């Protein structure tokens, strides 16, 4: 079988190039700048995914810069990077060699939805909690992902380990420096992005996380639509018409537009009757118009919906140990350093 070698730099650690050999390459998806490959590292047998992005001559690649700085059990790990030619003539491509994870939250959710079954609530708790940890960690550096959606939540279904991936839109937000509004994918965009705001904060990720939670509870996206106006109608049907004060907090250029006049649908009627009330209560504090009224990621981790995860005897339904849930660092806890009394339960200290 064909072995390929390349000179590549480790994603973490010494800025020191190494010979890297890999084999068994195969196409597993497509990217903006070429197909995505699986490969097997010859030295360890470990599976990686290799994706290509365009190298700009003018400035360092932001995704690589961010991914060299991150080290967290719920974020996909950058193993190596190297440059190559690619699909388009004359271009130089950055190749990111990431630890391979075989499934996503989206695949598991569609598997249950197609079967007209609800994802067991223990998995909803595990997946959302790990998502909020990954957000707490990146937000503690000032980094907003800007493209949270179920397809970017890699999943090992047997261990329930979740890893956030795709940092191609991620940015360190700086108050007073504008940001493009056109990030974040259909169905998951916060209303301030639908309105074209350039002055938003990392709370756009919490809105998107709320959309993922609601989708796991409902079995379908909560705010679908192919245009912003169709998405907004679905938002208003649930949250009710935003007030002028709320619109000023999202994008004050929009305060005087004539929005559909709709009373909020009660949150208890949004979801099916047997939906756990704490899940509805959490969703109601994530899907809020006023961006500063949304929970922060660490506050969401400490929400009572996640209390079952903090029980000394909780197990996966397949009998396994839960994955790592309490290895918080100072960095990850820093937005509220005295928090933890909830987050690290007694048996984890």
């Amino acid at each position: 079988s064909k072995v390929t070698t390349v000179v590549a730099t480790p994603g973490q650690g010494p800025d020191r190039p190494q010979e890297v050999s890999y084999t068994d390459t195969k196409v597993i998806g497509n990217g903006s700048f070429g197909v995505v490959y699986q490969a097997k590292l010859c030295d360890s047998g470990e599976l990686v995914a290799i994706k290509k992005v365009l190298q700009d001559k003018r400035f360092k690649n932001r995704e690589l810069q961010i991914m060299r700085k991150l080290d967290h059990c719920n974020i996909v790990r950058l193993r190596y990077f190297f440059y190559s030619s690619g699909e388009k003539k004359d271009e130089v491509y950055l190749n990111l060699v990431l630890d391979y994870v075989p499934e996503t939250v989206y695949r598991v959710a569609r598997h249950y939805s197609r079967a007209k079954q609800t994802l067991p609530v223990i998995y909803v708790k595990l997946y959302m909690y790990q998502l909020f940890r990954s957000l707490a960690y990146i937000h503690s550096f000032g980094i907003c992902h800007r493209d949270i959606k179920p397809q970017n939540l890699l999943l090992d279904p047997d261990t329930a380990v979740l890893k956030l991936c795709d940092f191609g839109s991620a940015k360190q937000l700086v108050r007073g420096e504008p940001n493009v509004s056109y990030i974040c994918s259909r169905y998951y965009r916060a209303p301030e992005l639908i309105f074209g705001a350039t002055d938003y904060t990392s709370s756009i990720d919490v809105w998107s996380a709320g959309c993922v939670l609601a989708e796991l509870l409902l079995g379908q996206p909560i705010f679908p639509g192919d245009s912003g106006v169709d998405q907004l109608v679905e938002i208003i049907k649930v949250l009710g018409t935003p007030t002028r004060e709320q619109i000023r907090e999202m994008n004050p250029n929009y305060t005087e537009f004539k929005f559909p006049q709709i009373k909020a649908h009660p949150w208890t009627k949004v979801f099916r009757p047997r939906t756990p009330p704490e899940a509805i209560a959490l969703c109601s504090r994530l899907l809020e118009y006023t961006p500063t009224a949304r929970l922060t990621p660490l506050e969401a981790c400490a929400h009572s919906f996640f209390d079952e995860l903090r029980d000394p005897n909780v197990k996966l339904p397949n009998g396994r140990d839960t994955p790592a849930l309490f290895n918080f660092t100072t960095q990850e806890l820093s937005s509220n350093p005295p928090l933890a009394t909830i987050l690290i339960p007694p048996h984890a200290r």
Binding site: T104, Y106, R107, V108, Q151, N152
Partner: peptide
């Protein structure tokens, strides 16, 4: 729409 071509759930 899916990240990967293959899935154990496909």
């Amino acid at each position: 729409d899916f990240r990967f071509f293959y899935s154990r759930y496909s």
